[PDB]
Design a protein around this ligand. Structure first.
Ligand SMILES: [Ca+2]
Length: 90
């Protein structure tokens, strides 16, 4: 369907074993079973994994993860949110 370049580096930094764990949390917010969660529910995904950045970097993260602008986050865009702050500029 689609293939953003940001997803090429995201899965490149995440090991197959890591991406597997991130999937466990995906189904958590994916109560619909469609494979898409609300960017507003992401704030909850943070405290779940382990992150407490400034509310600012949060909003920017949403507009930086939706490279398509569909209005929803997908497992593919998830791996990006992880490498988003894990590899912002370091
Ligand atoms: Ca999207």
């Amino acid at each position: 369907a689609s293939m953003t370049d940001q997803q090429a580096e995201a899965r490149a930094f995440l090991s197959e074993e890591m991406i597997a764990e991130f999937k466990a949390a995906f189904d958590m917010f994916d109560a619909d079973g469609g494979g898409d969660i609300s960017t507003k529910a992401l704030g909850t995904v943070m405290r779940m994994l382990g992150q407490n950045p400034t509310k600012e970097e949060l909003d920017a993260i949403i507009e930086e993860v939706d490279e398509d602008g569909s209005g929803t986050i997908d497992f593919e865009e998830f791996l990006v949110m992880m490498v988003r702050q894990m590899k912002e500029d370091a």
